[PDB]
Design a protein around this nucleic acid. Structure first.
Ligand code: K
Ligand code: K
Ligand code: K
Ligand code: MG
Ligand code: MG
Ligand code: MG
Ligand code: MG
Ligand code: MG
Ligand code: MG
Ligand code: MG
Ligand code: MG
Ligand code: MG
Ligand code: MG
Lengths: 107, 179, 95, 50, 47, 56, 50
RNA sequence: AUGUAUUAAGGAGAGUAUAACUUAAUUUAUGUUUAUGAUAGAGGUUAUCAACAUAUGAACUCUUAGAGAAAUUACUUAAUAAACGAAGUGAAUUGAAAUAUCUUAUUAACUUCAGGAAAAGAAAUCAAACGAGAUUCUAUGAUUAGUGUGAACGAAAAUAGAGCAGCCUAUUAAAAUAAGUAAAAUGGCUUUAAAGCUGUUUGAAUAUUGUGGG
């Protein structure tokens, strides 16, 4: 019963969130004995972290991040409303990264 | 312009208007035309002089003439440094005569020649070519050099090898005329 | 000239080479010396059949009341290509 | 063809829009002529009442 | 006016027959009981 | 008349450069992969995160 | 007006009075007169009593 | 006049049942309900004494093949106004109680191109040490900051409302992440000196392990 309720919470998220998690699933939600490097998603193979830029091996050019800094802030703000901020990859817009950087270094 | 005669190719360098008139010697079937693909960005609605040369992005610009003391404004114009040079094309092997600006002459030396200036695939260059630059781009694509160069770049990109070329159709009309 | 000048110009008003036809059809071609050669392939003839013995007149007696056709249940009653082909088989099978 | 039908539909609307402007103008001219013809019956009755 | 209504009716029935026959031909091409190829015997009553 | 326009609009496909043809060819292949799906096991693990960060 | 004149007997297209039936006048100088309808003008909705 | 909804090429010539509209100028059929409707008769010219819904025949000439003195010739199953939109070029009346900078005014107008809308659009954006999160429309912010001798001109952040949508695997097929480019000098535009647009002459760098713009 509890598992059926968990599946009803994941299917209640907005389509914008469910779409992102599908193509960039973190190791946390992958199977228990899963290996992070194996069964990678076709999107993950292009870039492990979509929010970070990715120098192309053949062309030696820094491809712009898949999600711009504006859109990274809309994912962090939309994920924090449904308590799914733990699944997004490292982002400078993360509320914990913003706070950690200040306390660590300061003004 | 008055373009030279391509050494080994019947096809002539296209006319400034886009037409490709074939000589009377070359036998041509009934109602056969050589059509160049339309220019993606279309002609230039102002300064039509730039539709017949390699002007890059330079147009005729209008401004004011400001007096020294009272600073009174009078309308004037700024014209690009348009010249007429004979640019060499390794693919064709002749001197393509065209009206080109001085800023585009520095772009031809920077990229390594006219052929390298016409084969650019970036969006900012196809806009700088213009209708006349898009006709020369189509012409060099018919040469065997560029055809043999593009076929070699498809083997490095893992593309299947790539029907009849335009120079073969004209070659098949000279043999059919004698039959 | 005040008002008549503003009407549509006709051939019964001016003569200095102004020509305008009545859409009577081209029956030939013009020659180089001002004559006309009638092409009888363009001339039209009227096919009137023999009316001797024909009993139908353009009127029907008012005793016979006007009645339409029912074609019950067939939306395209009079234009149904099925009732024209099926009706053909029974009546005229050869042609 | 689907593009040949739009041509017809467009023609059927252009003619019906012109037939309404003509019919309307005729309904107003015919009405204005009857009202003036009936008024002669109203005037005779008004003249006989006085 | 009555002579013009008979002339109009003649043009309505002839236009109706041309279109009805122009469609029966098409409908008769997909019929298994009609063979438009041979005109001598183009119809065979189904069993 | 339209078939002669779609062939005239796409008449510039014979003047494409190798990199222009490679990009387009890859685009067709990618659009066939589709979008990945979230299995019930993955959805069950996401529901735990939501309930843990909302109710406790 | 035709709908008002026929308001008491159906409508201009469903008239419920026919020639040959006796009627009684209820207006004018000759009120309470009784006669038989001879004609029935359906254009002006007027009736002739001989 | 405003609002709502729907729609996205317009006019003329001649002819014709003078409510009826195209030389067929009052075509021919279906279904339903018919006074408890809808909103046990007479009547085909002494007509259309039936509305709604769905089909259907016909629909001339010119604008509008070519030529020409539009509605003709000659041929043929030849066919698309205005306003609205973007860019280019760009005044003057007027105010300054004269007048040159300025204002009038990124105006009127013209020119090209395009669609039922167009344009714009998912930050090399704004903010200020907290953060916001594409574009468009309306008001406030604002006779404000500011500019200018003056007369006048005049933002943005933010707030509220209308709409809301994000993406590159774009729901219609596009990038191997952008070089004669960013930028500099100089001549102009815009403007507050920045940012932005630009003719001439020149001319970079390669990602928060701090490269590039603001
Ligand atoms: K003064
Ligand atoms: K001030
Ligand atoms: K500047
Ligand atoms: Mg005379
Ligand atoms: Mg005379
Ligand atoms: Mg003459
Ligand atoms: Mg013409
Ligand atoms: Mg014509
Ligand atoms: Mg405002
Ligand atoms: Mg970039
Ligand atoms: Mg610049
Ligand atoms: Mg700066
Ligand atoms: Mg800059």
């Amino acid at each position: 019963a509890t598992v059926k309720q968990h599946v009803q919470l994941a299917l209640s998220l907005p389509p914008r969130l469910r779409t992102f998690l599908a193509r960039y699933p973190p190791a946390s939600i992958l199977p228990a004995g899963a290996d992070p490097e194996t069964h990678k998603t076709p999107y993950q193979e292009e870039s492990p972290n979509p929010f970070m830029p990715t120098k192309h091996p053949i062309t030696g050019k820094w491809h712009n991040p898949k999600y711009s800094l504006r859109r990274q802030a809309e994912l962090v703000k939309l994920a924090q409303e449904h308590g799914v901020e733990e699944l997004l990859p490292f982002t400078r817009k993360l509320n914990e990264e913003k706070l950690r950087k200040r306390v660590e270094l300061g003004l | 312009y008055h373009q030279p005669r391509v050494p080994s190719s019947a096809i002539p360098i296209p006319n400034v208007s886009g037409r490709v008139p074939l000589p009377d010697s070359t036998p041509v079937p009934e109602d056969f035309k050589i059509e160049i693909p339309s220019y993606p960005y279309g002609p230039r609605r102002v300064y039509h002089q730039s539709n017949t040369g390699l002007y890059g992005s330079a147009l005729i610009r209008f401004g004011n003439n400001v007096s020294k003391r009272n600073e009174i404004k009078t309308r004037r114009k700024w014209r690009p440094n348009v010249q007429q040079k004979r640019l060499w094309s390794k693919s064709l092997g002749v001197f393509v005569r065209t009206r080109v600006t001085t800023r585009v002459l520095r772009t031809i030396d920077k990229v390594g020649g006219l052929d390298e200036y016409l084969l650019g695939h970036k969006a900012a260059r196809v806009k700088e070519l213009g209708p006349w630059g898009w006709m020369l781009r189509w012409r060099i694509m018919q040469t065997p050099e560029i055809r043999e160069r593009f076929a070699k770049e498809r083997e490095a990109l893992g593309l299947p090898p790539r029907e009849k070329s335009l120079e073969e159709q004209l070659r098949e009309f000279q043999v059919a005329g004698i039959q | 000239g005040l008002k008549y000048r503003k009407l549509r110009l006709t051939t019964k008003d001016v003569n200095k080479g102004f020509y305008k036809g009545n859409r009577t059809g081209s029956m030939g071609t013009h020659t180089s010396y001002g004559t006309y050669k009638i092409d009888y392939t363009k001339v039209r003839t009227y096919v009137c059949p023999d009316l001797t013995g024909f009993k139908l007149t353009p009127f029907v007696s008012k005793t016979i009341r006007p009645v339409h056709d029912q074609f019950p249940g067939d939306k395209l009653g009079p234009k149904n290509p099925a009732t024209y082909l099926a009706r053909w088989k029974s009546e005229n099978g050869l042609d | 063809m689907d593009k040949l039908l739009r041509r017809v539909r467009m023609a059927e609307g252009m003619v019906a829009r012109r037939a309404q402007r003509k019919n309307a103008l005729l309904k107003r001219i015919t009405e204005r002529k009857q009202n003036k013809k009936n008024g002669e019956a109203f005037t005779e009755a008004i003249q006989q009442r006085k | 006016r009555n002579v013009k209504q008979t002339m109009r009716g003649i043009k309505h029935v002839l236009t109706e027959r041309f279109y009805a026959w122009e469609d029966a031909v098409k409908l008769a091409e997909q019929d298994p009981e009609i063979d438009l190829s041979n005109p001598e015997n183009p119809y065979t009553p189904s069993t | 008349e339209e078939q002669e326009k779609e062939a005239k609009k796409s008449a510039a496909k014979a003047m494409l450069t190798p990199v222009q043809e490679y990009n387009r060819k890859q685009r067709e292949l990618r659009r066939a992969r589709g979008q990945p799906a979230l299995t019930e096991e993955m959805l069950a693990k996401i529901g735990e995160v939501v309930a843990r960060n909302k109710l406790g | 007006e035709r709908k008002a004149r026929v308001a008491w007997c159906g409508s201009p297209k469903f008239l419920c009075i026919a020639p040959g039936d006796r009627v009684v006048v209820i207006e004018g100088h000759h009120k309470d007169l009784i006669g038989t309808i001879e004609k029935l003008n359906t254009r002006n909705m007027t009736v002739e009593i001989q």
